[PDB]
Amino acid sequence: RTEKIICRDVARGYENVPIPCVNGVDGEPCPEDYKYISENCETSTMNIDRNITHLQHCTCVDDCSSSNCLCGQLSIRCWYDKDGRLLQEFNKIEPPLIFECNQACSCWRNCKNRVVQSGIKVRLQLYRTAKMGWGVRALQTIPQGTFICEYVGELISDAEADVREDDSYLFDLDNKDGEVYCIDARYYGNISRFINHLCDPNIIPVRVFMLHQDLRFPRIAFFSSRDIRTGEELGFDYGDRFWDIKSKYFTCQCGSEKCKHSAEAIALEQS
Amino acid sequence: TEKIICRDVARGYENVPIPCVNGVDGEPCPEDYKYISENCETSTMNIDRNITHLQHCTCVDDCSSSNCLCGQLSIRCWYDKDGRLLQEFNKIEPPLIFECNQACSCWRNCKNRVVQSGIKVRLQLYRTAKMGWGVRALQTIPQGTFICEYVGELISDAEADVREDDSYLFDLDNGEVYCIDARYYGNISRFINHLCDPNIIPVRVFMLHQDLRFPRIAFFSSRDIRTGEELGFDYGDRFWDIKSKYFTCQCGSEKCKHSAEAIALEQSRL
Ligand SMILES: CCCC[C@H](NC(=O)c1cccc(Nc2ccncc2)c1)C(=O)Nc1ccc(OC2CCN(C)CC2)nc1
Ligand SMILES: CCCC[C@H](NC(=O)c1cccc(Nc2ccncc2)c1)C(=O)Nc1ccc(OC2CCN(C)CC2)nc1
Ligand SMILES: Nc1ncnc2c1ncn2[C@@H]1O[C@H](C[C@@H](N)CC[C@H](N)C(=O)O)[C@@H](O)[C@H]1O
Ligand SMILES: Nc1ncnc2c1ncn2[C@@H]1O[C@H](C[C@@H](N)CC[C@H](N)C(=O)O)[C@@H](O)[C@H]1O
Ligand SMILES: [Zn+2]
Ligand SMILES: [Zn+2]
Ligand SMILES: [Zn+2]
Ligand SMILES: [Zn+2]
Ligand SMILES: [Zn+2]
Ligand SMILES: [Zn+2]
Ligand SMILES: [Zn+2]
Ligand SMILES: [Zn+2]
Numbered sequence: 001r002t003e004k005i006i007c008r009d010v011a012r013g014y015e016n017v018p019i020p021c022v023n024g025v026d027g028e029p030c031p032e033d034y035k036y037i038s039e040n041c042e043t044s045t046m047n048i049d050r051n052i053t054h055l056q057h058c059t060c061v062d063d064c065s066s067s068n069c070l071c072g073q074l075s076i077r078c079w080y081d082k083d084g085r086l087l088q089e090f091n092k093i094e095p096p097l098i099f100e101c102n103q104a105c106s107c108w109r110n111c112k113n114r115v116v117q118s119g120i121k122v123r124l125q126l127y128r129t130a131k132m133g134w135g136v137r138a139l140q141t142i143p144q145g146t147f148i149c150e151y152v153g154e155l156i157s158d159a160e161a162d163v164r165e166d167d168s169y170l171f172d173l174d175n176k177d178g179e180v181y182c183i184d185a186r187y188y189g190n191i192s193r194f195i196n197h198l199c200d201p202n203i204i205p206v207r208v209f210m211l212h213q214d215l216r217f218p219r220i221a222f223f224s225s226r227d228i229r230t231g232e233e234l235g236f237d238y239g240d241r242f243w244d245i246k247s248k249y250f251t252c253q254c255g256s257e258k259c260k261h262s263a264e265a266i267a268l269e270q271s
Numbered sequence: 272t273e274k275i276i277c278r279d280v281a282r283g284y285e286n287v288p289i290p291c292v293n294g295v296d297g298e299p300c301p302e303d304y305k306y307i308s309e310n311c312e313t314s315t316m317n318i319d320r321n322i323t324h325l326q327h328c329t330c331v332d333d334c335s336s337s338n339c340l341c342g343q344l345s346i347r348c349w350y351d352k353d354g355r356l357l358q359e360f361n362k363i364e365p366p367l368i369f370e371c372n373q374a375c376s377c378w379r380n381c382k383n384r385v386v387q388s389g390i391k392v393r394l395q396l397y398r399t400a401k402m403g404w405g406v407r408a409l410q411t412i413p414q415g416t417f418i419c420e421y422v423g424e425l426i427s428d429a430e431a432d433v434r435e436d437d438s439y440l441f442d443l444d445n446g447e448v449y450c451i452d453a454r455y456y457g458n459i460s461r462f463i464n465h466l467c468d469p470n471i472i473p474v475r476v477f478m479l480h481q482d483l484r485f486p487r488i489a490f491f492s493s494r495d496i497r498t499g500e501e502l503g504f505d506y507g508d509r510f511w512d513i514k515s516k517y518f519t520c521q522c523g524s525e526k527c528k529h530s531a532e533a534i535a536l537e538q539s540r541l
Contacts (some may be wrong), residue, residue: 013379037373041322052311052456103307109283154322188322 006030010126014038016119019191025128041236042155046060049214057104064111071113074099084115086117086145086223088109092204100210117210120149131253132196135233142228149218153185169193175216198235199256208253276300280396284308286389289459304457311456312425319482327374334381341383344369354385355415362493368476385417386489387478401521402464405501412496416473421460421488423453444481447484466503468524470494
């Protein structure tokens with residue numbers, strides 16, 4: 001079966017690069033039960049704290065590559081190397097909040113501390129998968145620790161997430177301060193909603209702050225956990241809360257020799 | 272002797288650098304304000320950003336037809352194929368402009384996305400002979416071209432009352448009344464002086480939200496602008512009804528409305 005290009009950009013031009021769609025697997029058409037949006041949206045009263053005076057900000061007169069940058073020290077340190085990539089020593093299982101520089105900082109918009117706010121840079125592709133529906137894969141080699149894209153969607157409350165019957169696209173921000181908030185990319189979302197779960201993941205989510213510092217609304221950034229070959233499927237560990245829920249419905253089809261949520265794994269766990 | 276005292280007053284925040292020169296006196300680069308590319312808030316404004324309240328269009332082409340609902344909201348799309356306002360655009364009393372948004376089915380590069388696309392002409396902060404700092408064009412600018420947005424601090428009408436230095440205060444005007452104070456927070460617009468014979472006009476635009484209490488102020492050339500010309504708009508009589516007693520006008524256009532000698536004619540006739 002030929003692998004037919006079916007959308008030259010599902011992003012409709014809102015990203016820095018086009019995100020094309022292909023299907024060389026079956027006859028499913030281009031997904032369109034959703035609204036592609038590049039940044040988070042709201043559908044109820046949220047009042048994100050956008051007071052510019054509330055912003056912690058640095059006084060740097062360099063490119064903010066020094067350990068004296070206040071933005072960095074907030075982040076423990078700036079975990080970005082010279083090329084914008086997430087340092088190898090990054091506690092990539094217990095990752096701390098990253099505060100990027102903002103509009104209150106004295107530094108320039110091109111400082112070393114502005115990776116996530118600068119948008120997608122890698123060429124990605126939405127494609128049809130063998131046993132998982134749609135997915136996202138890389139069209140280039142991606143060095144470890146590179147920023148991929150942001151988990152974008154509809155900002156909703158922990159209570160609103162309890163009510164929603166379709167939790168296939170629900171990201172739990174998990175607010176330590178106050179109440180949990182969540183991102184539901186079921187009706188409004190970006191390329192991130194199409195990323196499948198891998199028991200051997202290659203991207204990780206990081207909580208990030210940029211143009212605001214309202215702690216109920218960290219933004220989710222995905223970075224490569226490893227070097228990634230061209231054509232290879234992006235996926236992150238959805239977690240064990242997702243799979244104790246969706247265990248009655250489907251099972252993991254990732255195939256990994258260390259797969260935790262395949263039908264065999266569950267049935268072998270019941271003994 | 273002209274010197275360059277800043278390579279980009281916006282610090283890379285605009286699509287193009289906005290340098291500052293002075294060949295007039297010893298005033299260094301003004302730094303008594305934070306430059307911001309986009310409006311900021313210093314208290315809770317409760318701007319309706321509910322995506323489901325956006326009026327949006329269903330076009331798939333470039334939104335150049337008359338079934339573009341976002342053009343209908345604006346009477347018509349007033350942008351020509353090159354992003355410029357049509358010659359027939361009501362310049363005295365512009366109509367509100369509703370640009371296409373993130374709820375539109377159209378693409379981000381359609382014909383109704385001028386102001387949201389940012390500064391494109393080359394502009395320069397320079398020291399004028401009499402008006403402190405001004406903003407001059409670095410290039411020929413045809414009529415209808417978007418120049419810049421009036422960016423600053425959103426404040427209420429009551430706040431604007433207790434603001435002592437009202438030399439950067441712009442009126443949106445309305446039920447509920449709000450202001451843009453560019454005094455403490457501003458973009459390059461705060462340096463555009465007043466000209467009795469203006470060559471730019473402000474237009475109220477809506478882009479990512481359609482909260483009618485917070486139009487964004489977009490400047491467009493009301494005529495062709497020659498290379499080196501200073502950008503100015505008509506502050507209006509409200510500004511000069513409180514500022515003229517302190518300082519008189521210096522535009523010097525033959526048809527000056529707030530000049531020194533133009534005050535004496537109305538004072539002598541009346
Ligand atoms: C598109 C798929 C979403 C993935 C998953 N979705 C859900 O679990 C989910 C689903 C439905 C409903 C709700 N929510 C509520 C339900 C009822 N009532 C209330 C709420 C949540 C996810 O969120 N995965 C994930 C993985 C790592 C991570 O990284 C940090 C955390 C761990 N450490 C490693 C530190 C870093 N953060 C998140
Ligand atoms: C440095 C730039 C000043 C601009 C000027 N500022 C002031 O005059 C001003 C000055 C001091 C104080 C306040 N304000 C408050 C005072 C007290 N308490 C509360 C507030 C306002 C301006 O806004 N000019 C303008 C011109 C046309 C226009 O276009 C439409 C509106 C009207 N029509 C004639 C055409 C359509 N819009 C705006
Ligand atoms: N490892 C997996 N094994 C089986 N199905 C998966 C796996 N990961 C994701 N999925 C499927 O994709 C959904 C998660 C979505 N966020 C991903 C996009 C979705 N697959 C789509 O094509 O629209 C899940 O509810 C599953 O239906
Ligand atoms: N036509 C004018 N005649 C005299 N002074 C003007 C005129 N237009 C603007 N100004 C001056 O500039 C102020 C308005 C400012 N927003 C413009 C930038 C200002 N020239 C500056 O150097 O910061 C006024 O309060 C005046 O001090
Ligand atoms: Zn810094
Ligand atoms: Zn900073
Ligand atoms: Zn910085
Ligand atoms: Zn698995
Ligand atoms: Zn349209
Ligand atoms: Zn539209
Ligand atoms: Zn459009
Ligand atoms: Zn004058």
